[PDB]
Amino acid sequence: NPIHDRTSDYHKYLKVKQGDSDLFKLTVSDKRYIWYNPDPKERDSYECGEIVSETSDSFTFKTVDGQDRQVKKDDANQRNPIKFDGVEDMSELSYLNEPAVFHNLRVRYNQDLIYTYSGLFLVAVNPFKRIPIYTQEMVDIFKGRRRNEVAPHIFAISDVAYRSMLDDRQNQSLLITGESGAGKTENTKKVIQYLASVAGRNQANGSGVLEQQILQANPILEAFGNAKTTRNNNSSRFGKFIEIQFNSAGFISGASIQSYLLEKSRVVFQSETERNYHIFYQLLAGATAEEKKALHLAGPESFNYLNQSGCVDIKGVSDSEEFKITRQAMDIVGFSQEEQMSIFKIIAGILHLGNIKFEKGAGEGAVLKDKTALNAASTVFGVNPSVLEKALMEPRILAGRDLVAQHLNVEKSSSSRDALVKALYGRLFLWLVKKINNVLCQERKAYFIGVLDISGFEIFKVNSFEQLCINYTNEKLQQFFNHHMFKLEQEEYLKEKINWTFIDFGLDSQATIDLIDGRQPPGILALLDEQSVFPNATDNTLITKLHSHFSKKNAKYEEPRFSKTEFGVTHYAGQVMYEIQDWLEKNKDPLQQDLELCFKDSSDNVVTKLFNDPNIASRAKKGANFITVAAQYKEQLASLMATLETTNPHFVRCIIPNNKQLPAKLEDKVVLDQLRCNGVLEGIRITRKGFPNRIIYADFVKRYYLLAPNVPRDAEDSQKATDAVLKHLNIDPEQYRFGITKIFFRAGQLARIEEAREQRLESNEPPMDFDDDIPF
Ligand SMILES: Oc1c(Cl)cc(Cl)cc1-c1[nH]c(Cl)c(Cl)c1Cl
Numbered sequence: 001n002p003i004h005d006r007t008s009d010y011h012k013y014l015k016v017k018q019g020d021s022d023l024f025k026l027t028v029s030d031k032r033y034i035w036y037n038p039d040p041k042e043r044d045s046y047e048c049g050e051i052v053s054e055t056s057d058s059f060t061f062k063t064v065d066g067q068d069r070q071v072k073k074d075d076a077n078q079r080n081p082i083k084f085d086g087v088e089d090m091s092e093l094s095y096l097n098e099p100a101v102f103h104n105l106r107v108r109y110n111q112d113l114i115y116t117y118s119g120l121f122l123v124a125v126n127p128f129k130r131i132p133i134y135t136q137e138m139v140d141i142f143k144g145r146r147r148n149e150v151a152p153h154i155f156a157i158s159d160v161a162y163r164s165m166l167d168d169r170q171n172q173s174l175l176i177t178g179e180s181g182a183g184k185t186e187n188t189k190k191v192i193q194y195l196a197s198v199a200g201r202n203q204a205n206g207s208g209v210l211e212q213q214i215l216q217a218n219p220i221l222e223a224f225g226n227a228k229t230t231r232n233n234n235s236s237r238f239g240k241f242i243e244i245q246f247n248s249a250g251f252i253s254g255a256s257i258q259s260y261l262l263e264k265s266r267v268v269f270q271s272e273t274e275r276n277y278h279i280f281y282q283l284l285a286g287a288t289a290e291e292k293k294a295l296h297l298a299g300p301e302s303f304n305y306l307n308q309s310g311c312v313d314i315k316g317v318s319d320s321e322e323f324k325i326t327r328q329a330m331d332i333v334g335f336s337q338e339e340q341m342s343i344f345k346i347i348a349g350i351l352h353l354g355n356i357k358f359e360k361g362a363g364e365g366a367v368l369k370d371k372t373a374l375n376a377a378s379t380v381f382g383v384n385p386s387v388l389e390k391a392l393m394e395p396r397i398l399a400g401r402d403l404v405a406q407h408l409n410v411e412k413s414s415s416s417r418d419a420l421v422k423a424l425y426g427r428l429f430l431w432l433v434k435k436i437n438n439v440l441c442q443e444r445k446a447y448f449i450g451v452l453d454i455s456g457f458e459i460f461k462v463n464s465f466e467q468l469c470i471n472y473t474n475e476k477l478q479q480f481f482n483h484h485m486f487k488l489e490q491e492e493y494l495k496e497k498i499n500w501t502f503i504d505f506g507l508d509s510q511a512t513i514d515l516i517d518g519r520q521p522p523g524i525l526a527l528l529d530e531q532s533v534f535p536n537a538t539d540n541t542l543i544t545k546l547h548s549h550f551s552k553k554n555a556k557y558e559e560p561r562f563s564k565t566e567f568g569v570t571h572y573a574g575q576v577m578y579e580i581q582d583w584l585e586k587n588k589d590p591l592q593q594d595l596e597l598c599f600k601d602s603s604d605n606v607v608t609k610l611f612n613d614p615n616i617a618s619r620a621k622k623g624a625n626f627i628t629v630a631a632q633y634k635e636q637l638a639s640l641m642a643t644l645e646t647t648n649p650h651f652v653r654c655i656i657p658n659n660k661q662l663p664a665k666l667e668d669k670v671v672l673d674q675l676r677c678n679g680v681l682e683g684i685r686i687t688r689k690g691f692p693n694r695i696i697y698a699d700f701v702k703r704y705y706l707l708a709p710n711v712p713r714d715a716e717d718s719q720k721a722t723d724a725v726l727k728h729l730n731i732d733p734e735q736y737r738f739g740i741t742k743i744f745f746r747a748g749q750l751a752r753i754e755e756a757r758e759q760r761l762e763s764n765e766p767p768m769d770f771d772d773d774i775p776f
């Protein structure tokens with residue numbers, strides 16, 4: 001058995017190595033230690049010290065330098081006996097404090113053990129290197145097992161969610177949190193792989209094609225939705241909720257993807273060191289010379305949208321190679337050969353639109369002297385060059401019921417051109433998801449397991465509207481964890497009259513959430529929207545109004561003294577300064593009508609569908625104004641959060657080791673901040689101090705059959721039939737508790753103590769067969 005075979009890859013890559021005789025001598029020692037700060041200023045840098053003596057209220061130890069210090073037993077972060085070092089579930093630690101938790105993760109990390117349980121949820125520290133722990137062999141390991149039977153792994157928590165989906169007939173969800181680069185996407189891929197395995201149909205015609213397409217749906221989304229940012233080479237620039245559908249029996253019947261917040265502005269601009277979306281680079285370097293000449297494509301350096309960051313390649317990634325994988329993925333999912341060609345003739349078109357150079361004419365209006373880029377764009381898009389030109393520089397609008405042609409200056413024509421580009425890309429991205437959904441969505445499933453893979457918390461030198469929406473979302477997800485771990489848990493105990501004194505874990509980011517999406521009084525997004533439909537509003541009137549409402553009034557808001565165009569929001573993961581530039585236009589997300597008219601007449605099927613299809617080219621309208629981006633998003637997110645509330649949540653906390661994307665470099669300061677703001681320790685405390693399991697009094701006749709005074713499934717008094725199979729083995733009485741309608745178990749009695757009554761190999765058929773047929 002791989003599990004019990006100390007030579008298996010499983011025991012080599014998922015278990016803690018056997019300590020040697022020298023480590024044993026240290027393990028059996030009587031000496032005690034404490035975690036302390038050598039430099040009181042650097043509170044996250046710890047060293048180990050031996051406790052040499054104690055008072056009734058203090059400990060005295062010895063600093064690595066031989067120095068001696070005294071601390072109060074209450075302010076002491078004691079070090080757990082080393083037999084705990086590497087423990088797979090930290091809720092089992094004797095001492096639960098920051099240095100102790102970080103240490104255990106470190107010990108496991110140093111051995112390439114990136115997974116560790118922290119009570120009910122899983123913690124994943126990004127290794128930044130490959131570890132052979134995701135093979136089909138590994139999958140077949142964890143298929144069918146108890147979480148406490150196998151080692152910590154993303155597969156394990158995946159199986160658990162899967163078993164719970166069946167045993168309870170309830171929909172589940174895998175919520176994977178983490179700042180940018182932490183490992184959310186990578187783990188998301190494993191959840192799907194595992195589920196498409198243990199639940200897929202026998203790999204065959206359709207029987208193994210559905211789950212094959214499900215897996216190929218993501219490589220597509222990645223080429224168009226991911227890009228290199230300063231924090232992650234493969235950063236997801238869009239959020240994703242993936243539903244894995246199962247039939248009544250329990251088999252995969254399909255899936256659907258719901259995307260959120262594509263960072264459209266990236267197509268036309270990238271900070272020094274960033275890249276545009278991967279797809280642009282894969283095309284230029286992976287297309288045939290004929291395709292290259294058919295789309296008038298050159299090198300990345302010959303396009304404004306690709307030669308501004310100073311970076312066109314990623315260390316260890318062959319864009320030419322990835323292009324093959326994307327195409328190959330499009331084939332499998334079901335994209336026609338024409339569609340694909342269209343898909344690249346919009347991508348190629350976008351690059352050309354970027355090269356259009358507008359210039360100041362004789363007046364203030366713009367003019368296009370060199371039309372090489374313009375004609376090339378029109379060419380591949382299949383639209384009239386003359387019409388697009390006029391639409392770009394001279395769009396028509398209404399003025400008091402009068403059609404008057406505009407003549408935009410250089411700056412404005414440039415923006416309109418960018419506006420067109422972003423609309424094309426965003427719509428194209430939406431189309432792909434739609435196309436992909438139709439292929440995977442073809443069955444009325446009953447249960448589903450939702451996998452959430454959002455853009456993680458991020459901070460850059462310059463943070464704009466996009467970052468606010470991203471961080472607001474991560475703030476909601478964190479509060480979703482706070483809710484289901486501390487609030488809902490304690491309201492249960494409350495109504496359950498189990499005798500619990502309320503605990504305040506100090507984890508609540510509702511103030512910050514309100515400050516952003518509040519309506520009454522109005523939060524940032526509200527004020528933003530208000531300004532967006534104000535005729536005379538400007539980025540200046542917006543920042544001023546925001547300061548007016550929150551400066552020195554909201555505790556999570558800050559009007560900086562060093563700038564007049566930024567405001568700081570204090571998030572769970574830290575304070576972020578936001579630059580207000582362009583927020584109004586970004587919120588309104590305008591696009592000249594002429595531009596759309598121009599493209600509605602494209603000779604290309606994909607292009608026309610992006611401009612004629614209501615569910616893609618249309619915008620929900622609020623009265624005389626279109627719905628803003630802030631409002632649309634808030635709406636979308638609230639919906640998602642509404643869906644998760646109807647599922648049984650399984651949490652996975654991804655942790656980034658450092659900020660350099662380097663392996664074997666676990667920085668304590670970087671890791672502890674995350675452990676604190678994620679509420680990892682409070683989540684462990686709530687489990688050790690509480691009662692997770694809670695069966696109803698009625699259905700309490702489940703695994704409890706005659707293991708006491710004879711009492712089968714039946715009893716006519718429930719409160720009574722309950723303390724009945726328990727007292728036999730005289731289980732500790734304050735190791736559980738009785739509630740108004742349920743029975744709670746501390747630190748999991750069902751597993752800790754109940755190991756004889758259940759999980760036995762005796763008590764079913766051996767306690768009753770001694771005199772089977774032979775009695776005289
Ligand atoms: O990107 C857009 C711009 Cl600029 C304007 C309008 Cl009126 C609609 C969109 C739009 N609609 C839909 Cl539906 C998607 Cl998806 C996108 Cl993107």
Ligand SMILES: [Mg+2]
Nearest residue numbers: 184185235236
């Ligand atoms: Mg990601």
